[PDB]
Amino acid sequence: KVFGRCELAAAMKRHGLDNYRGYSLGNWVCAAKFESNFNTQATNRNTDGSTDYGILQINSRWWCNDGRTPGSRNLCNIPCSALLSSDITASVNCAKKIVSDGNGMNAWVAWRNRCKGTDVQAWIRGCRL
Ligand code: NA
Numbered sequence: 346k347v348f349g350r351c352e353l354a355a356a357m358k359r360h361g362l363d364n365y366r367g368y369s370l371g372n373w374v375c376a377a378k379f380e381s382n383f384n385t386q387a388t389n390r391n392t393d394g395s396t397d398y399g400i401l402q403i404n405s406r407w408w409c410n411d412g413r414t415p416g417s418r419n420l421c422n423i424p425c426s427a428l429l430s431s432d433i434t435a436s437v438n439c440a441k442k443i444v445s446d447g448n449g450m451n452a453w454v455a456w457r458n459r460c461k462g463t464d465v466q467a468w469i470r471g472c473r474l
Pocket residue numbers: 405406407408409410411414417418419
C-alpha cells in the first residue's frame with residue numbers, strides 16, 4: 346500500500362505514534378516519507394547483507410526475522426514480511442521499541458539527515474487528525 350501523507354498521519358496517530366517518546370507526528374511522517382515514500386512494500390538491501398522492510402525501513406540486523414541475515418536478532422519477535430502489510434500495526438509496534446532503545450529517532454539515519462531540526466509540522470499541515 347502507498348499511503349497518502351494525511352492518511353498515514355491518521356494511521357500513525359490511531360496506533361499511538363503521535364508524541365511517542367516525545368516525537369511529534371510530523372517527525373514520524375517525515376521519516377516514513379524519506380525511508381519508504383509511504384510505500385508499505387519498500388525493501389532495501391544493506392551492504393552488510395541485512396535488509397530494511399516497510400514504511401519505516403526496519404532492519405533485519407536487529408528487529409525482525411527474514412532467515413537470511415547471519416548473526417542477526419529479532420527483537421520485535423516478527424517475520425520481516427509483517428512489516429510489508431497494508432496494516433501498519435507491526436511496523437508501528439516495532440518502531441516504538443526501536444525509538445525506545447536509547448538514540449530516539451537517530452536510529453533512522455534518513456530522519457537524522459533529512460527530518461531532524463526541520464519544520465516537521467509541515468508534514469501534517471492541512472490533515473484532519
Ligand atoms: Na534478524
